[model samples]
Target: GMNIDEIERKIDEAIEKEDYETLLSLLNKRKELMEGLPKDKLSEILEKDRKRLEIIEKRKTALFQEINVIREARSSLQK
Candidate 1:
């Protein structure tokens, strides 16, 4: 039930906290809202949202890779 500005604020906070789950959830909700609405005439806003989503996805991937590397290092050390 959140409006776009409120959702955007939460998304920014989630990104700041590195909370990928929240970010993804908020993004999905935003996507759903967007789908129900008519297309935005502001191409810039849409483009910005697309880019921010991409950055968030990349960060999530990097974090997963870092975790995997740590796990491998620990396992090797234990061996």
Candidate 2:
């Protein structure tokens, strides 16, 4: 299993950079990990754990722009 601290730091960096693609990718990985766990294992995680995961997923959903918007726009501007 990956160290949760390292995963959390990635999340922080993604947010700081406004790198939504990275954030979305990371959140999707988290969701996959959560879903893959056995039911009993999932149940052992506290409500806070679930809530934090949901918050990240919700943020991803709420973001209006495409994840690569900034990069694509920059590329287009250079053309």
Candidate 3:
């Protein structure tokens, strides 16, 4: 399991580069790390996890929307 600081740093670096692929990979790894824990341990961190998920969801939405916009713009040029 990665330390919180290491996890955060990797995510930040990926976002800085606008690498949504890397961001998704890191997000899944981080989620797996958290979800693999025992339920009792997870309950202790539930609030923090919820907030983290909200941020991740927002980022994912933004990245996907941008990618879609770029793809559509390129398609328009193809006509």
Candidate 4:
């Protein structure tokens, strides 16, 4: 397992790079670390997690929209 702060920075780096796959992995890695955190810091981590999730969700929505657009393009070709 890595240091919590180290994981935090990695998450931000992935976010800035818009690498969702790496972000998924780093998020999975930190989820395991979240369990070991002290209660006092739990809320702080929770808050950070929310902020991180906000961007991720925004990215996910864009990706989904792109997929739908491609599907529509393909549907036109089939008809």
Candidate 5:
């Protein structure tokens, strides 16, 4: 498990490059912070996390369609 400073930097880098490090890992770090959060700047985080987390659903569907396209691309080549 990573601490606050390292966790912040880890996610900061992911956003900087648009490279999502493992969704589970990223969410866990955020949850750690988001959890330890209330127990200052966090009240806003709860509001924000909901919105960004919502986007994850859309991204998941997009990935499904992308994989389907790839499969069809391969099918045509095989035929």
Candidate 6:
């Protein structure tokens, strides 16, 4: 239900906080909006979108690794 500007601000906040899950959700919403627009206009922002996706993927991988480390530590302590 968010307007495009709200979504964009939310996306920026998510990235600043390394919140990949929220970023992905916002990106999906943004994608829907972008797809509905004309291709010529869309081309202008495609590069920025691609870079953001790349950064989000990298951050997701790092988050997964950090969680795995925490889980391993917990298991070691539990044993």
Instruction: Say which candidate scores most in lDDT.
Output: 4
lDDT tens digits by residue: candidate 4, 1-79: 6888898889899998998799899888988888889997788878888988898899889999999999999999998
lDDT score of model 4?
Answer: 0.88
Candidate 1 residues lying further than 4 Å off, grouped into runs, are 36-38, 41-45, 64-79
Candidate 2 lDDT score at position 72: 86
The worst-scoring run of ten residues by lDDT in candidate 4 lies at 40-49
Candidate 6 — which pairs collide? Answer: none
> Candidate 6 lDDT, tens digit per residue, 1-78?
886668878987998898878988998998888767677657755756687778878977998999999999999999
lDDT of 1 by residue, 19-66 (tens): 879988998988777755556634544877797878878987998999
On a 0 to 1 TM-score scale, where does candidate 4 land against the true structure? 0.73
Q: Number of backbone collisions per candidate, in order?
A: 0, 0, 0, 0, 0, 0
Task: Report the Cα lDDT for residue 35, model 3.
Answer: 58
CA lDDT scores, all candidates in order: 0.81, 0.67, 0.75, 0.88, 0.66, 0.81
Candidate 5: tens digits of C-alpha lDDT, residues 1-79? 6765566556546644556665457768677566565525576655555765666667778899999999999999998
Best by TM-score: 4
- Candidate 3 lDDT, tens digit per residue, 15-52? 66777799788878777677567777667557655765
Q: Estimate each model's TM-score.
A: 0.58, 0.40, 0.48, 0.73, 0.52, 0.56
Full candidate order by lDDT, most accurate first: 4, 6, 1, 3, 2, 5
Q: What is the TM-score (0 to 1) of candidate 2?
A: 0.40
